[PDB]
Amino acid sequence: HGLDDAQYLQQKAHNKRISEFRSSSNSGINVTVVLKYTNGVVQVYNWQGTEVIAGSLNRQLMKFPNYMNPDKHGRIEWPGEGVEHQHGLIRSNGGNGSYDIGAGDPYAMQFIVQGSVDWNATRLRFFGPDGSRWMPDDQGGASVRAGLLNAAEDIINSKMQPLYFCDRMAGKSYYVRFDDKYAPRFPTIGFEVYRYRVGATNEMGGESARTAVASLISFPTFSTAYVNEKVAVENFFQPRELVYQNSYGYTV
Amino acid sequence: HGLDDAQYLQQKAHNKRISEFRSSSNSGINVTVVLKYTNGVVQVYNWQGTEVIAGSLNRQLMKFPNYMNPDKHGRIEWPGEGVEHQHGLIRSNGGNGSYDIGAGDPYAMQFIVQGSVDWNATRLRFFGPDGSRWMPDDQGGASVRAGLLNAAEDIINSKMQPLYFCDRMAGKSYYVRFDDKYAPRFPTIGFEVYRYRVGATNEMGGESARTAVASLISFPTFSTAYVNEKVAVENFFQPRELVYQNSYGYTV
Amino acid sequence: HGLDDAQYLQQKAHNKRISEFRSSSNSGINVTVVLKYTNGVVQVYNWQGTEVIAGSLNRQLMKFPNYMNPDKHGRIEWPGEGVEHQHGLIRSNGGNGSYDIGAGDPYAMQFIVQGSVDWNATRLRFFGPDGSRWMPDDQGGASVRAGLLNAAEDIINSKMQPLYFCDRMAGKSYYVRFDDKYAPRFPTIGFEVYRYRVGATNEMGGESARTAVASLISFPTFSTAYVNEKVAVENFFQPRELVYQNSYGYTV
Ligand SMILES: [Ca+2]
Ligand SMILES: [Ca+2]
Ligand SMILES: [Ca+2]
């Protein structure tokens, strides 16, 4: 030996570069919401950002199908799951002739965050279908006058599971069923995800103000619905090198 | 007496807490746009935020029905009120075969703001259907070169009416008809609503920059259309404890 | 002479006012995305702002028709260009029974920026249909782990063409074909456009923080599709006094 140490070192340097690039303030951080439906459908929403990733989904987008992702016949709503149905979710006994539970009302959600993220700072907020701040312990939803928009429970970091890519943790995932227990049965959501900083300089303000504000909405939001998780993982998540926990609790 | 002063005081403390919580920077502020249609339909858009609530509605969302709120048959546009119709609004005599005035073109709007808000700072901007800055006094719409994006008239605070919840003012409401007089006949809107601060520390910047920027889009926007105001008030506004002025000028 | 110098001077002062008003931090800056389709259709998206204009378009809005701009029959998708089609764009050979290239997949884009803009600071980012950061030189799309969200090539200022209104430059335009050469064949985009400042005070932060953040989303986004460029120019661009480069390279 050692006749190919230069090629080796070069590959080593390349690997180091890709793996550590995540900590760059100009790399991507990713927030993915995977909605799960009792017919096997999964609807993906994926946000990208550099310093801060924020967003939300109201019922119109929590449900399937919708104006963003029509079903295979170009329909954005289903019979029995249209306006009257939504009205019955907004207010108990406030609807009319519709299905009790929509086929297109998700039963669960996976929330995935990937990147060099300030994990502890992550906020995931649950609201009812009417935009009311939701509370655990059979407390129901809070009005606008009593509703705490930033609660201790929004910090979900400790409930999230570490997801590895090779030998390092790449991201964290949270799985929750919509059962009125640990989450609303017909929720809407808001979220905030923050860049982990390798220094003390505030890149959300000062000389960085103009780009910090712009970056909030200057990255397209990917979204689609897939016939099932298997297809979503092979055709989206894997090629993106987004980590994802499958139905069996495996990181894929 | 006084054998239940502890229960009394406790209820008193609870009431004080809910009523004053509104001034907390972590409470909710609410901005509601209620669009009114000549068929009795009201379309509600409700934004929530902590420090700053901003948003806008273009014609696609000013009209009914739309991709956000389809009619009872899953339709997002009506015959005679589709693309050619919109084209006739954008430019005088620029359309073709459509109704002169859409059933789904709103005739009026109520703008409601609720919370501990910096009332004087509120901005409501009117634009034409083509995004032109609209002007009063038969001046018409301004081009991009002459258009003032922040005008004295955007400060509508003095035209808004105080809306009480019990013995305190909870919010303010502005009612305007779309008649080319005090508002465009086919308007689009933009708005900015600001947290009233109980101190001098700028919570929109400095150490608060990261959360101030995130909070702009991290709360879901509620939206629906109701068959009439009566149903909207009993099934949405009242349970939310959002104040609202009805068709008779009454606070409900 | 000179019996009408007062009228002359007055017109002169008026002209000076309109022409220089663009440099006011309270004037408008405009960002227009014109998508071009092989059937002659052009779809316009026009953003307005004061200090910073940012936005993006995912495939749902890059394509025609969509939920924002339905075709003449109220349809938001076409046969053979619906969900399965989108799936074939997201992943090579990941779709099924659909047209190879949608009639509604744009073949080119004009990107126009107008106002007193910090021209050099302009960012236009290209992504693939799956939200992957796109690269030139047959390099393909980058994963989330390797993707550089702020690249040297996003600064397109030097590739843009000056567009005059009278004797001054009013804006700049960039024309690009979606051919996998200088742009993705099925792109999605994100952009950031910045106010040119006539002073050193940072109006994106400090005492200007609250309004800087709000202004990001407080101006409605105009959007429509026109049967062809000729109609779009006479009925939208010209009356708005937005400069625009036509199919012949002429400023109109
Ligand atoms: Ca308990
Ligand atoms: Ca007058
Ligand atoms: Ca080369």
PDB file of C-alpha atoms in Angstrom, chain A:
ATOM      1  CA  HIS A   1       0.000   0.000   0.000  1.00  0.00           C
ATOM      2  CA  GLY A   2      -1.057   2.778   0.032  1.00  0.00           C
ATOM      3  CA  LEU A   3      -1.710   3.479  -3.636  1.00  0.00           C
ATOM      4  CA  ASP A   4      -5.162   5.093  -3.487  1.00  0.00           C
ATOM      5  CA  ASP A   5      -5.075   7.206  -0.342  1.00  0.00           C
ATOM      6  CA  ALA A   6      -5.692  10.345  -2.401  1.00  0.00           C
ATOM      7  CA  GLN A   7      -8.892   8.899  -3.851  1.00  0.00           C
ATOM      8  CA  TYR A   8      -9.844   7.716  -0.366  1.00  0.00           C
ATOM      9  CA  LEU A   9      -9.164  11.076   1.293  1.00  0.00           C
ATOM     10  CA  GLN A  10     -11.068  12.819  -1.495  1.00  0.00           C
ATOM     11  CA  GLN A  11     -14.134  10.628  -0.912  1.00  0.00           C
ATOM     12  CA  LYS A  12     -13.683  11.212   2.828  1.00  0.00           C
ATOM     13  CA  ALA A  13     -13.630  15.006   2.315  1.00  0.00           C
ATOM     14  CA  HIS A  14     -16.712  14.753   0.075  1.00  0.00           C
ATOM     15  CA  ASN A  15     -18.582  12.735   2.705  1.00  0.00           C
ATOM     16  CA  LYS A  16     -17.569  15.140   5.445  1.00  0.00           C
ATOM     17  CA  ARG A  17     -18.780  18.038   3.324  1.00  0.00           C
ATOM     18  CA  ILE A  18     -22.257  16.635   2.642  1.00  0.00           C
ATOM     19  CA  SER A  19     -22.795  15.416   6.217  1.00  0.00           C
ATOM     20  CA  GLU A  20     -21.745  18.679   7.870  1.00  0.00           C
ATOM     21  CA  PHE A  21     -23.261  20.977   5.254  1.00  0.00           C
ATOM     22  CA  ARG A  22     -26.559  20.606   7.154  1.00  0.00           C
ATOM     23  CA  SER A  23     -25.207  22.954   9.827  1.00  0.00           C
ATOM     24  CA  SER A  24     -24.684  25.678   7.204  1.00  0.00           C
ATOM     25  CA  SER A  25     -27.203  28.522   7.535  1.00  0.00           C
ATOM     26  CA  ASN A  26     -27.587  28.185   3.747  1.00  0.00           C
ATOM     27  CA  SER A  27     -28.423  24.504   3.747  1.00  0.00           C
ATOM     28  CA  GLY A  28     -32.002  23.285   3.878  1.00  0.00           C
ATOM     29  CA  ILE A  29     -34.139  22.414   6.852  1.00  0.00           C
ATOM     30  CA  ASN A  30     -37.261  20.370   6.092  1.00  0.00           C
ATOM     31  CA  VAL A  31     -40.657  20.128   7.759  1.00  0.00           C
ATOM     32  CA  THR A  32     -42.943  17.366   6.554  1.00  0.00           C
ATOM     33  CA  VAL A  33     -46.559  16.751   7.453  1.00  0.00           C
ATOM     34  CA  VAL A  34     -47.831  13.327   6.428  1.00  0.00           C
ATOM     35  CA  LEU A  35     -51.598  12.960   6.790  1.00  0.00           C
ATOM     36  CA  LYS A  36     -52.929   9.400   6.967  1.00  0.00           C
ATOM     37  CA  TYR A  37     -56.333   8.245   5.725  1.00  0.00           C
ATOM     38  CA  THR A  38     -58.365   5.137   6.524  1.00  0.00           C
ATOM     39  CA  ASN A  39     -58.300   4.197   2.829  1.00  0.00           C
ATOM     40  CA  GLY A  40     -54.501   4.007   2.912  1.00  0.00           C
ATOM     41  CA  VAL A  41     -53.940   7.364   1.232  1.00  0.00           C
ATOM     42  CA  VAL A  42     -51.144   9.555   2.560  1.00  0.00           C
ATOM     43  CA  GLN A  43     -51.075  13.259   1.778  1.00  0.00           C
ATOM     44  CA  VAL A  44     -47.634  14.880   1.976  1.00  0.00           C
ATOM     45  CA  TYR A  45     -46.882  18.539   2.672  1.00  0.00           C
ATOM     46  CA  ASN A  46     -43.199  19.433   2.711  1.00  0.00           C
ATOM     47  CA  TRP A  47     -41.871  22.884   3.645  1.00  0.00           C
ATOM     48  CA  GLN A  48     -38.272  24.055   3.125  1.00  0.00           C
ATOM     49  CA  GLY A  49     -36.351  26.935   4.688  1.00  0.00           C
ATOM     50  CA  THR A  50     -32.960  28.153   5.891  1.00  0.00           C
ATOM     51  CA  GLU A  51     -33.400  29.969   9.215  1.00  0.00           C
ATOM     52  CA  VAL A  52     -37.055  29.450  10.068  1.00  0.00           C
ATOM     53  CA  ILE A  53     -39.762  27.189   8.703  1.00  0.00           C
ATOM     54  CA  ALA A  54     -43.319  28.118   9.688  1.00  0.00           C
ATOM     55  CA  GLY A  55     -46.722  27.132   8.345  1.00  0.00           C
ATOM     56  CA  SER A  56     -50.173  25.787   9.026  1.00  0.00           C
ATOM     57  CA  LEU A  57     -52.959  23.660   7.579  1.00  0.00           C
ATOM     58  CA  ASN A  58     -56.658  24.434   7.932  1.00  0.00           C
ATOM     59  CA  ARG A  59     -59.392  21.776   7.424  1.00  0.00           C
ATOM     60  CA  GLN A  60     -59.567  22.493   3.689  1.00  0.00           C
ATOM     61  CA  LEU A  61     -56.011  21.139   3.423  1.00  0.00           C
ATOM     62  CA  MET A  62     -56.140  18.617   6.284  1.00  0.00           C
ATOM     63  CA  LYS A  63     -58.863  16.751   4.419  1.00  0.00           C
ATOM     64  CA  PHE A  64     -58.573  14.700   1.246  1.00  0.00           C
ATOM     65  CA  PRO A  65     -59.223  15.462  -1.470  1.00  0.00           C
ATOM     66  CA  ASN A  66     -58.839  19.241  -1.822  1.00  0.00           C
ATOM     67  CA  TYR A  67     -57.992  22.105  -4.159  1.00  0.00           C
ATOM     68  CA  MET A  68     -54.288  21.326  -3.759  1.00  0.00           C
ATOM     69  CA  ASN A  69     -54.668  17.582  -4.293  1.00  0.00           C
ATOM     70  CA  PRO A  70     -57.844  16.581  -6.228  1.00  0.00           C
ATOM     71  CA  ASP A  71     -58.750  12.881  -6.425  1.00  0.00           C
ATOM     72  CA  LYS A  72     -58.182  10.849  -9.594  1.00  0.00           C
ATOM     73  CA  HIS A  73     -61.239  12.467 -11.197  1.00  0.00           C
ATOM     74  CA  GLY A  74     -60.266  16.082 -10.628  1.00  0.00           C
ATOM     75  CA  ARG A  75     -62.590  16.401  -7.646  1.00  0.00           C
ATOM     76  CA  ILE A  76     -61.665  18.542  -4.667  1.00  0.00           C
ATOM     77  CA  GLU A  77     -64.453  17.264  -2.447  1.00  0.00           C
ATOM     78  CA  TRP A  78     -66.450  14.062  -2.000  1.00  0.00           C
ATOM     79  CA  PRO A  79     -70.211  13.455  -1.722  1.00  0.00           C
ATOM     80  CA  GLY A  80     -71.224  13.593   1.932  1.00  0.00           C
ATOM     81  CA  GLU A  81     -67.919  15.246   2.840  1.00  0.00           C
ATOM     82  CA  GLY A  82     -68.519  18.719   1.431  1.00  0.00           C
ATOM     83  CA  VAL A  83     -69.755  21.957   2.922  1.00  0.00           C
ATOM     84  CA  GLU A  84     -72.490  20.546   5.196  1.00  0.00           C
ATOM     85  CA  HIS A  85     -70.002  17.982   6.511  1.00  0.00           C
ATOM     86  CA  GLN A  86     -67.442  20.669   7.351  1.00  0.00           C
ATOM     87  CA  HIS A  87     -70.184  22.591   9.143  1.00  0.00           C
ATOM     88  CA  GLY A  88     -70.858  19.563  11.378  1.00  0.00           C
ATOM     89  CA  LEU A  89     -67.192  19.515  12.357  1.00  0.00           C
ATOM     90  CA  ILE A  90     -66.996  23.251  13.109  1.00  0.00           C
ATOM     91  CA  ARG A  91     -69.927  23.051  15.545  1.00  0.00           C
ATOM     92  CA  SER A  92     -71.388  19.978  17.251  1.00  0.00           C
ATOM     93  CA  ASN A  93     -74.676  19.163  15.540  1.00  0.00           C
ATOM     94  CA  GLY A  94     -74.111  22.180  13.283  1.00  0.00           C
ATOM     95  CA  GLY A  95     -74.115  20.274  10.009  1.00  0.00           C
ATOM     96  CA  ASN A  96     -76.773  18.357   8.106  1.00  0.00           C
ATOM     97  CA  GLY A  97     -76.799  15.440   5.665  1.00  0.00           C
ATOM     98  CA  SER A  98     -73.259  14.090   5.550  1.00  0.00           C
ATOM     99  CA  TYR A  99     -71.156  11.151   6.679  1.00  0.00           C
ATOM    100  CA  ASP A 100     -70.372  11.041  10.392  1.00  0.00           C
ATOM    101  CA  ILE A 101     -66.641  10.673   9.675  1.00  0.00           C
ATOM    102  CA  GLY A 102     -65.294  11.572   6.270  1.00  0.00           C
ATOM    103  CA  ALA A 103     -63.281   9.054   4.324  1.00  0.00           C
ATOM    104  CA  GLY A 104     -61.151  12.127   3.702  1.00  0.00           C
ATOM    105  CA  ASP A 105     -60.830  13.137   7.363  1.00  0.00           C
ATOM    106  CA  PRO A 106     -57.338  12.017   8.372  1.00  0.00           C
ATOM    107  CA  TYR A 107     -57.075   9.672  11.378  1.00  0.00           C
ATOM    108  CA  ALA A 108     -53.434  10.358  12.113  1.00  0.00           C
ATOM    109  CA  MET A 109     -50.414  12.454  11.314  1.00  0.00           C
ATOM    110  CA  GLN A 110     -46.677  12.071  11.176  1.00  0.00           C
ATOM    111  CA  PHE A 111     -44.747  15.283  11.768  1.00  0.00           C
ATOM    112  CA  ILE A 112     -41.131  15.097  10.592  1.00  0.00           C
ATOM    113  CA  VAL A 113     -38.374  17.662  10.953  1.00  0.00           C
ATOM    114  CA  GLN A 114     -34.989  17.196   9.272  1.00  0.00           C
ATOM    115  CA  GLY A 115     -31.814  19.281   9.328  1.00  0.00           C
ATOM    116  CA  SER A 116     -29.544  21.085  11.757  1.00  0.00           C
ATOM    117  CA  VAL A 117     -32.520  22.214  13.786  1.00  0.00           C
ATOM    118  CA  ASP A 118     -32.878  23.850  17.193  1.00  0.00           C
ATOM    119  CA  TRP A 119     -34.820  20.778  18.296  1.00  0.00           C
ATOM    120  CA  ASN A 120     -36.010  22.141  21.627  1.00  0.00           C
ATOM    121  CA  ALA A 121     -37.484  25.218  19.976  1.00  0.00           C
ATOM    122  CA  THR A 122     -39.861  23.316  17.702  1.00  0.00           C
ATOM    123  CA  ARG A 123     -43.515  24.324  18.059  1.00  0.00           C
ATOM    124  CA  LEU A 124     -46.463  22.242  16.882  1.00  0.00           C
ATOM    125  CA  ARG A 125     -49.874  23.739  17.747  1.00  0.00           C
ATOM    126  CA  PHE A 126     -53.201  21.878  17.618  1.00  0.00           C
ATOM    127  CA  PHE A 127     -56.500  23.639  16.960  1.00  0.00           C
ATOM    128  CA  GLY A 128     -60.029  22.372  16.473  1.00  0.00           C
ATOM    129  CA  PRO A 129     -61.824  22.509  13.112  1.00  0.00           C
ATOM    130  CA  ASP A 130     -63.113  25.977  14.094  1.00  0.00           C
ATOM    131  CA  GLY A 131     -59.624  27.334  14.848  1.00  0.00           C
ATOM    132  CA  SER A 132     -60.065  26.992  18.597  1.00  0.00           C
ATOM    133  CA  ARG A 133     -57.008  26.276  20.730  1.00  0.00           C
ATOM    134  CA  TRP A 134     -57.335  22.618  21.732  1.00  0.00           C
ATOM    135  CA  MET A 135     -56.700  21.302  25.236  1.00  0.00           C
ATOM    136  CA  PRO A 136     -56.143  17.842  26.735  1.00  0.00           C
ATOM    137  CA  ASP A 137     -57.960  16.211  29.678  1.00  0.00           C
ATOM    138  CA  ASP A 138     -61.430  16.461  28.111  1.00  0.00           C
ATOM    139  CA  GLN A 139     -61.133  20.253  28.440  1.00  0.00           C
ATOM    140  CA  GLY A 140     -62.236  20.804  24.831  1.00  0.00           C
ATOM    141  CA  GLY A 141     -61.433  23.907  22.796  1.00  0.00           C
ATOM    142  CA  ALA A 142     -60.730  27.403  24.118  1.00  0.00           C
ATOM    143  CA  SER A 143     -62.345  30.619  22.884  1.00  0.00           C
ATOM    144  CA  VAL A 144     -60.362  33.569  21.497  1.00  0.00           C
ATOM    145  CA  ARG A 145     -60.518  35.294  24.888  1.00  0.00           C
ATOM    146  CA  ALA A 146     -59.016  32.438  26.927  1.00  0.00           C
ATOM    147  CA  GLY A 147     -56.922  30.703  24.250  1.00  0.00           C
ATOM    148  CA  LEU A 148     -53.176  30.518  24.895  1.00  0.00           C
ATOM    149  CA  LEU A 149     -51.504  30.644  21.460  1.00  0.00           C
ATOM    150  CA  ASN A 150     -48.093  29.597  22.807  1.00  0.00           C
ATOM    151  CA  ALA A 151     -48.419  26.746  25.295  1.00  0.00           C
ATOM    152  CA  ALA A 152     -45.871  24.549  27.042  1.00  0.00           C
ATOM    153  CA  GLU A 153     -47.289  21.556  25.106  1.00  0.00           C
ATOM    154  CA  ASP A 154     -46.420  23.048  21.714  1.00  0.00           C
ATOM    155  CA  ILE A 155     -42.821  22.145  22.504  1.00  0.00           C
ATOM    156  CA  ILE A 156     -43.057  18.549  21.331  1.00  0.00           C
ATOM    157  CA  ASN A 157     -39.320  17.882  21.126  1.00  0.00           C
ATOM    158  CA  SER A 158     -39.321  15.208  23.862  1.00  0.00           C
ATOM    159  CA  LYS A 159     -42.153  13.240  22.268  1.00  0.00           C
ATOM    160  CA  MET A 160     -40.366  13.089  18.903  1.00  0.00           C
ATOM    161  CA  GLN A 161     -38.300  10.076  17.903  1.00  0.00           C
ATOM    162  CA  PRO A 162     -34.736  10.343  16.585  1.00  0.00           C
ATOM    163  CA  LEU A 163     -34.392   9.293  12.958  1.00  0.00           C
ATOM    164  CA  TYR A 164     -30.946   8.258  11.774  1.00  0.00           C
ATOM    165  CA  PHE A 165     -29.418   8.452   8.338  1.00  0.00           C
ATOM    166  CA  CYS A 166     -26.372   6.172   8.573  1.00  0.00           C
ATOM    167  CA  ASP A 167     -24.553   6.896  11.825  1.00  0.00           C
ATOM    168  CA  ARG A 168     -25.927  10.344  12.673  1.00  0.00           C
ATOM    169  CA  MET A 169     -29.370  11.581  13.619  1.00  0.00           C
ATOM    170  CA  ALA A 170     -30.793  13.473  10.654  1.00  0.00           C
ATOM    171  CA  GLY A 171     -34.222  14.316  11.986  1.00  0.00           C
ATOM    172  CA  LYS A 172     -37.044  13.654  14.403  1.00  0.00           C
ATOM    173  CA  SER A 173     -40.540  12.339  13.908  1.00  0.00           C
ATOM    174  CA  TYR A 174     -43.801  12.563  15.858  1.00  0.00           C
ATOM    175  CA  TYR A 175     -46.714  10.186  15.323  1.00  0.00           C
ATOM    176  CA  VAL A 176     -50.106  11.110  16.685  1.00  0.00           C
ATOM    177  CA  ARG A 177     -53.596   9.706  16.296  1.00  0.00           C
ATOM    178  CA  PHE A 178     -56.498  12.114  15.963  1.00  0.00           C
ATOM    179  CA  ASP A 179     -58.691  10.667  18.705  1.00  0.00           C
ATOM    180  CA  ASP A 180     -59.541  13.609  20.987  1.00  0.00           C
ATOM    181  CA  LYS A 181     -57.045  12.122  23.452  1.00  0.00           C
ATOM    182  CA  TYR A 182     -53.543  13.406  22.626  1.00  0.00           C
ATOM    183  CA  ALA A 183     -54.806  15.354  19.628  1.00  0.00           C
ATOM    184  CA  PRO A 184     -58.112  16.771  18.324  1.00  0.00           C
ATOM    185  CA  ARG A 185     -60.224  14.357  16.317  1.00  0.00           C
ATOM    186  CA  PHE A 186     -60.655  16.959  13.554  1.00  0.00           C
ATOM    187  CA  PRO A 187     -57.539  19.112  14.007  1.00  0.00           C
ATOM    188  CA  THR A 188     -55.943  21.949  12.155  1.00  0.00           C
ATOM    189  CA  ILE A 189     -52.298  22.721  12.811  1.00  0.00           C
ATOM    190  CA  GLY A 190     -49.656  25.417  12.950  1.00  0.00           C
ATOM    191  CA  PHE A 191     -45.916  24.890  13.301  1.00  0.00           C
ATOM    192  CA  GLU A 192     -42.574  26.683  13.758  1.00  0.00           C
ATOM    193  CA  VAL A 193     -39.177  25.109  13.199  1.00  0.00           C
ATOM    194  CA  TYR A 194     -35.884  26.863  13.846  1.00  0.00           C
ATOM    195  CA  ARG A 195     -32.333  26.692  12.568  1.00  0.00           C
ATOM    196  CA  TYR A 196     -29.752  25.451  15.076  1.00  0.00           C
ATOM    197  CA  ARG A 197     -27.149  28.177  15.288  1.00  0.00           C
ATOM    198  CA  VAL A 198     -23.448  27.382  15.586  1.00  0.00           C
ATOM    199  CA  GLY A 199     -22.829  30.894  16.901  1.00  0.00           C
ATOM    200  CA  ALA A 200     -24.371  33.773  18.855  1.00  0.00           C
ATOM    201  CA  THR A 201     -25.070  36.130  15.971  1.00  0.00           C
ATOM    202  CA  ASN A 202     -28.806  36.539  15.459  1.00  0.00           C
ATOM    203  CA  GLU A 203     -29.371  35.694  11.807  1.00  0.00           C
ATOM    204  CA  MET A 204     -33.117  36.375  12.191  1.00  0.00           C
ATOM    205  CA  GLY A 205     -32.445  40.087  12.596  1.00  0.00           C
ATOM    206  CA  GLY A 206     -29.901  42.879  12.436  1.00  0.00           C
ATOM    207  CA  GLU A 207     -27.993  42.875   9.143  1.00  0.00           C
ATOM    208  CA  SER A 208     -29.773  39.595   8.360  1.00  0.00           C
ATOM    209  CA  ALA A 209     -33.295  40.992   8.743  1.00  0.00           C
ATOM    210  CA  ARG A 210     -34.107  41.415   5.056  1.00  0.00           C
ATOM    211  CA  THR A 211     -33.226  37.821   4.129  1.00  0.00           C
ATOM    212  CA  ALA A 212     -34.681  36.323   7.299  1.00  0.00           C
ATOM    213  CA  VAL A 213     -38.119  37.779   6.550  1.00  0.00           C
ATOM    214  CA  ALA A 214     -37.959  36.910   2.827  1.00  0.00           C
ATOM    215  CA  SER A 215     -36.942  33.296   3.451  1.00  0.00           C
ATOM    216  CA  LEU A 216     -40.230  32.697   5.265  1.00  0.00           C
ATOM    217  CA  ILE A 217     -42.126  32.319   1.955  1.00  0.00           C
ATOM    218  CA  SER A 218     -39.477  32.153  -0.805  1.00  0.00           C
ATOM    219  CA  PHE A 219     -39.259  28.349  -0.968  1.00  0.00           C
ATOM    220  CA  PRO A 220     -41.991  26.391  -2.735  1.00  0.00           C
ATOM    221  CA  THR A 221     -44.060  23.994  -0.631  1.00  0.00           C
ATOM    222  CA  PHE A 222     -44.192  20.503  -2.076  1.00  0.00           C
ATOM    223  CA  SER A 223     -47.487  18.641  -1.773  1.00  0.00           C
ATOM    224  CA  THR A 224     -49.106  15.534  -3.191  1.00  0.00           C
ATOM    225  CA  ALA A 225     -51.222  12.548  -2.204  1.00  0.00           C
ATOM    226  CA  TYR A 226     -50.067   8.971  -2.735  1.00  0.00           C
ATOM    227  CA  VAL A 227     -52.119   5.761  -2.975  1.00  0.00           C
ATOM    228  CA  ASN A 228     -50.180   4.478   0.033  1.00  0.00           C
ATOM    229  CA  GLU A 229     -47.106   4.887   2.215  1.00  0.00           C
ATOM    230  CA  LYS A 230     -45.083   2.335   0.227  1.00  0.00           C
ATOM    231  CA  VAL A 231     -45.350   4.399  -2.968  1.00  0.00           C
ATOM    232  CA  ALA A 232     -44.702   7.696  -1.119  1.00  0.00           C
ATOM    233  CA  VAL A 233     -41.469   6.366   0.393  1.00  0.00           C
ATOM    234  CA  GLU A 234     -40.009   4.940  -2.826  1.00  0.00           C
ATOM    235  CA  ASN A 235     -41.020   7.801  -5.113  1.00  0.00           C
ATOM    236  CA  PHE A 236     -40.659  10.839  -2.838  1.00  0.00           C
ATOM    237  CA  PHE A 237     -39.037  10.370   0.587  1.00  0.00           C
ATOM    238  CA  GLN A 238     -36.131   8.072  -0.366  1.00  0.00           C
ATOM    239  CA  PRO A 239     -34.916  10.001  -3.475  1.00  0.00           C
ATOM    240  CA  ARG A 240     -35.158  13.250  -1.478  1.00  0.00           C
ATOM    241  CA  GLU A 241     -33.085  11.588   1.231  1.00  0.00           C
ATOM    242  CA  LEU A 242     -35.768  12.673   3.668  1.00  0.00           C
ATOM    243  CA  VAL A 243     -35.911  10.331   6.649  1.00  0.00           C
ATOM    244  CA  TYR A 244     -39.345   8.936   7.438  1.00  0.00           C
ATOM    245  CA  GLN A 245     -40.786   6.470   9.968  1.00  0.00           C
ATOM    246  CA  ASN A 246     -42.991   3.810   8.338  1.00  0.00           C
ATOM    247  CA  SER A 247     -46.146   2.118   9.715  1.00  0.00           C
ATOM    248  CA  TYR A 248     -43.964  -0.411  11.510  1.00  0.00           C
ATOM    249  CA  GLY A 249     -41.901   2.144  13.404  1.00  0.00           C
ATOM    250  CA  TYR A 250     -38.913   1.645  11.090  1.00  0.00           C
ATOM    251  CA  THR A 251     -36.815   4.552   9.852  1.00  0.00           C
ATOM    252  CA  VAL A 252     -36.905   4.542   6.049  1.00  0.00           C
TER     253      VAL A 252
END
